[PDB]
Amino acid sequence: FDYTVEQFADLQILRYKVPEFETLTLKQKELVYYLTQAALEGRDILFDQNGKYNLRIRRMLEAVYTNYKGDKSAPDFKNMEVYLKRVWFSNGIHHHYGMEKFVPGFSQDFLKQAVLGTDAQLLPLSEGQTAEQLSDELFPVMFDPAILAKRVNQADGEDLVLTSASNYYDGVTQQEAESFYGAMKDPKDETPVSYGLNSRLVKIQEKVWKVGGLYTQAIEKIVYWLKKAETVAENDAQKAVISKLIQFYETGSLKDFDEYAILWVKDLDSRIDFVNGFTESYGDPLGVKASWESLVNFKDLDATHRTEIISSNAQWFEDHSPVDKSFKKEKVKGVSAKVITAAILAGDLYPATAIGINLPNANWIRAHHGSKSVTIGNITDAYNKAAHGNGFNEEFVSNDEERQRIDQYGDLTGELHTDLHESLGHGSGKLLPGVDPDALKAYGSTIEEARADLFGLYYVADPKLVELKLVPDAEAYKAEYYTFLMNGLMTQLVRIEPGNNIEEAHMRNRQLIARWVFEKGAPDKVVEMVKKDGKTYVVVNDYEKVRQLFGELLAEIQRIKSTGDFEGARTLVENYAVKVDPALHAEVLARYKKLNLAPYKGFINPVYELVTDKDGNITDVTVSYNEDYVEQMLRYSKDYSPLPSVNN
Ligand code: NA
Ligand SMILES: [Zn+2]
């Protein structure tokens, strides 16, 4: 199985497996199939939400690209291909992370001639429009750096509604938009609708995304496949979820959306689950309108059971903690996050995706009905598997014994450390009476993540995990110990710009732990940093002493948090967690850049096929992985692209 697909620009395309899909019942596979069809129909929505020109630009380049009769080896065509591949990845013409508009690496004269050489019937022309007129419209949008420069602008002194290229507002100023929703809100409402979540605000009124409204060509298709899924629901709770979601798309009512989210949160038992709707509001500079996304999934039973083994032993880990007894909870309950297996990704989860989903967003629904927080095990596993043999550990790990141990156990003990951090680490320990939870002020997040990390590091090495059948042998933890220390002392510097220091809380907490252990172990050479041929390597000489030092730092940090010791917190962060050595930074960056590893990853989907008999009865559902990036993007643009090119 090849987890890697291709690499271009600053992007690497991966694939993921869908483990145990074939173990589902046929009726379950059929439900997954329909839900995945409902997911794939939404792609055009996101393109249009990200920019009123995006579908025209995508479709124009697609028509040029697939019908090009010229020299495909020439630099202009190769650069146009890279640009189109970035547009597919980013669901528009802006960087999916940085928000800045792409710079075409090809000439306007080249594109003009390629466009004129394409059959006009294949171009996204409005009725009566010519190819020259389409070019006059779109070329400034693509080529002029001053036009629509940022998809989301967060700069002062500017009308962000007018200086953001996303397409949630049209012909309306920022103050008009902020005031529209400031006035709509009702502060007396204990169960408020999510005002403005599902509409374009235009001139002042809302154009709601719904059947018979804006984007209806795609929403009608989503609803069609959801109605199919409704007929094969696993149980009545899940069926009620699907039925209400259909109603939300048919009416556009935000009260229906709240009703759906309540039913969704109550559907906790079903093997299969999904998201399909206007969900997260990061694409709006005002944080009101939500981009469309979908995910279809089923519970990873083995992985969930493993996290439940950790959760059910919360009290054992608490009792045996190295922290002072006065900081220990007498009764602690562990909460396990379920692990899900993603069957397909779409919209703002595709191709750049998440490793966890925590929904719904409405705080009152979360407070009074609950929530679903899950991690996506097969996406995490694909990230991990794709990295094996990529040259990174070959370049940076001190010796072949470590490289082999990490290759064998690194993925397992890494995920176990995460499970310990997330399911028990933050929940462990208590403050003393009268201590302010905010006593550590700006250092609180760094110290709190260090605390959870140390809890996980201290216990991933415990023989208890062998007894509990979570690790296959007592040596495995050394893989996680080595990579944690290598990352925290040295190799995370690849994320720091030249001349800068450590700023982000997790990066700080990792350097804090590693540098502290390094300092305290130095008289015994517990950890060394050694140079060979001018390259630095982290060398770990006594893993047992590292465990004891992790435990000692855990006790000190627990003390700092539970007593509100701001000066102690500040001393640890400022002395260990911030300063970057310039020589080490440059050395690590030069070694890393030679590896040609792309900084951003995204995934292509598998392909599902419905097998039916003569009379249309389903006889099987198969999943296949033999499609690459170009193929899948073109197939989606051909078969799952129901929106008109202009959505006004
Ligand atoms: Na050694
Ligand atoms: Zn955390």
Residue numbers in the entry: 24 to 226, 231 to 675
Sentences from the paper on this structure:
Since we failed to obtain crystals from the purified wild-type protein, we assumed that the heterogeneity introduced by the oxidation of thiol groups had impeded crystallization. Thus, our results suggested that the observed charge heterogeneity in the purified BtDPP III was not caused by the oxidation of a single thiol group, but rather the outcome of oxidative modification of several thiol groups. Therefore, we prepared an additional variant with all five cysteine residues replaced by serine (Cys-null variant). Further crystallization screens were prepared using microseeding, and crystals of the Se-Met-labelled Cys-null protein were obtained in four new conditions: JCSG+ C10, E2, G11, and Midas G7. The structure was solved at 2.4 Å resolution using molecular replacement, with the structure of the Cys-null variant as a search model. Both proteins crystallized in space group P3121, with one molecule in the asymmetric unit. By superimposing the wild-type on the Cys-null structures, we confirmed that the replacement of cysteine residues or the incorporation of Se-Met did not change the protein structure (backbone RMSD 0.15 Å). In the crystal structure of the Cys-null variant (open form), one Tris molecule, contained in the storage buffer, was bound to the zinc ion.
DPP III (EC 3.4.14.4; earlier names: dipeptidyl arylamidase III, dipeptidyl aminopeptidase III) is a cytosolic zinc-metallopeptidase of the M49 family. Despite a low sequence identity (17–21%), the overall structure of BtDPP III is very similar to the previously reported crystal structures of human and yeast DPP III and consists of two domains separated by a wide cleft. The catalytic zinc ion is positioned in the lower part of the upper structural domain, coordinated by His448, His453, and Glu476.
